[PDB]
Design a protein around this nucleic acid. Structure first.
Ligand SMILES: [Mg+2]
Ligand SMILES: [Mg+2]
Ligand code: NA
Length: 323
DNA sequence: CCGACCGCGCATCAGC
DNA sequence: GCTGATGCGCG
DNA sequence: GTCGG
């Protein structure tokens, strides 16, 4: 109902993040954008909006101007500025953040041609992000997420029938399209107690590469792989776009905290974690522990709901965590 | 007013 | 090489 | 930029 407002604020949040490098302003706009996005009425005024938490005086003024004119002067100016525009653009390349973006514009590299021209000034992650720049902009229809899932789950079962591979992220929240693919991996040999087998993640990355599902690698350690994959296409069929894929190997006994984390959303995780802090707990992808203001021992978790119970939240299905 | 704003993996660099 | 700080990315 | 104390 409030698409224009939420777009406005998301553009503002991006600006603060990419250009101003004021992350708290970025988070302020993102929170507001999210609370408004779920408000079940068409906002008639900035006062009506200010009743929501996250919407304050400043954002209320914004919403009133946008409502009046259909525009924000602040944004129309930001759009008109070259340094800001270029910086904001460059940041869309995976691996180029606000700092790299600003250094690049400093050197006179500010367009997509410039980047291609200057690949030797790019690190690996950056080169692959430029390579698949167009692809990584596309969303993934759920139907393709379903094929991708089959592949990953079937291949992993071939490396060792004891791996458990769970697709998380937006896919798990039931989205009709996903920004990418997110795979939580567990193997019984790897727990909080011990790592009984080396290269648990490697063998999996290896296998998925062997069958040409994984095509590139952005980053890779003992527990986190961040890379690129592609569905196989039929005879004469145009190739599918290349897609980002993240794989996270998590202690088997810490699954429920792991799957909570990877299911998100990102904003939901930030809100859940902040609420946990007020309630007197700290939540990460491994454990929830009680808080001198210093973290205690891991409390026993047997489901995602047990985590919710701790911080006195009613349970929310994954499909309701898309904040 | 003002402090506080999650939590963490991997790549890179400085500095030793 | 190592440690630690910083950039970037994940949700 | 917002908000809680
Ligand atoms: Mg995702
Ligand atoms: Mg994401
Ligand atoms: Na991802």
């Amino acid at each position: 109902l409030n698409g224009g407002i939420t777009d406005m604020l998301t553009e503002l949040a991006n600006f603060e993040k990419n250009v101003s490098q004021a992350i708290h302003k970025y988070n302020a706009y993102r929170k507001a954008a999210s609370v408004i996005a779920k408000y079940p009425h068409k906002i008639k005024s900035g006062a009506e909006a200010k009743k929501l938490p996250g919407v304050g005086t400043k954002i209320a003024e914004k919403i009133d101007e946008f409502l009046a004119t259909g525009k924000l002067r602040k944004l129309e100016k930001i759009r008109q500025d070259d340094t800001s525009s270029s910086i904001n653009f460059l940041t869309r390349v995976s691996g180029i953040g606000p700092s790299a973006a600003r250094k690049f514009v400093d050197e006179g590299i500010k367009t997509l041609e410039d980047l291609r021209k200057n690949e030797d000034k790019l690190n690996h992650h950056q080169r692959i992000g430029l390579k698949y720049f167009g692809d990584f902009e596309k969303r993934i229809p759920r139907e393709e997420m379903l094929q991708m899932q089959d592949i990953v789950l079937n291949e992993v079962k071939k490396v060792d029938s004891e791996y458990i591979a769970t697709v998380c992220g937006s896919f798990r929240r039931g989205a009709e399209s996903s920004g990418d693919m997110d795979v939580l991996l567990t193997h019984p040999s790897f727990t909080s107690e011990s790592t009984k087998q080396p290269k648990l993640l490697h063998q999996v990355v290896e296998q998925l590469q062997k069958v040409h599902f994984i095509t590139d690698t952005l980053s890779k350690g003992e527990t986190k792989f961040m890379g690129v994959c592609q569905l196989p296409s039929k005879n004469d069929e145009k190739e599918y776009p290349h897609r980002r894929i993240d794989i996270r190997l998590i202690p088997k006994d810490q699954y429920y905290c792991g799957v909570l984390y990877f299911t998100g959303s990102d904003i939901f995780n930030k809100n859940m974690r902040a609420h946990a802090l007020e309630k007197g707990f700290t939540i990460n992808e491994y454990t929830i522990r009680p808080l001198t203001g210093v973290a205690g021992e891991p409390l026993p978790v047997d489901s995602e709901k047990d985590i919710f119970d701790y911080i006195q939240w009613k349970y929310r299905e994954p499909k309701d965590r898309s904040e």
